Amino acid sequence: GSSGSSGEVQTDVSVDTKHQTLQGVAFPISRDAFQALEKLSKKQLNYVQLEIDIKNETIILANTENTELRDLPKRIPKDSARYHFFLYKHSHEGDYLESVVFIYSMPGYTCSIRERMLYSSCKSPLLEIVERQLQMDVIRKIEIDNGDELTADFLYDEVHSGPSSG
């Protein structure tokens, strides 16, 4: 009979403390995978399909084809978890610029928990790549549960990092 009664059980009212992270996986960078992000830095394309290999244990290339915004969410797979680097172009203060966005779609249907956790934890060692090689930094990280959420009304939101409720 622990439950039932409710009151001031949290006697914190003092300094708080938090961990540094939840996972800690670091996979190597493949050639094809890198070459895909390389062009992205030279403003050549606006779509990079990357993923992690469970057999090779590394971030390899999954695909590479031009993609737009109106069809951005139309390219996202509905039966495979991978990354999608979209070049969201906007005009701040009347100045048109280019920004590389990070998208991570995860369907999660049959793939074990070891694969879904390894595909979302492999982003860490994948982000430092362009941040330690191409010297390029992502405009903002975005993760969905389908891929349709990727819209000009959503992307612009994350990129802005503006305030929100929940």
Swiss-Prot record:
Recorded superkingdom: Eukaryota
Residues with Phosphotyrosine modification: Y156
Modification after translation: Phosphorylated on serine and threonine residues.
Tissue-level expression: Widely expressed with highest levels in brain, liver and kidney. Also expressed in heart, lung and testis. Not detected in spleen or skeletal muscle.
Modified residues (Phosphoserine): S124
Protein location: Cytoplasm; Cytoplasm, Cytoskeleton
Domain ADF-H: 22-160
Family: Belongs to the actin-binding proteins ADF family. Twinfilin subfamily.
Assembly mode: Interacts with G-actin; ADP-actin form and capping protein (CP). May also be able to interact with TWF2 and phosphoinositides, PI(4,5)P2. When bound to PI(4,5)P2, it is down-regulated. Interacts with ACTG1.
Function text: Actin-binding protein involved in motile and morphological processes. Inhibits actin polymerization, likely by sequestering G-actin. By capping the barbed ends of filaments, it also regulates motility. Seems to play an important role in clathrin-mediated endocytosis and distribution of endocytic organelles.
Name this polypeptide is given: Twinfilin-1
Gene: Twf1
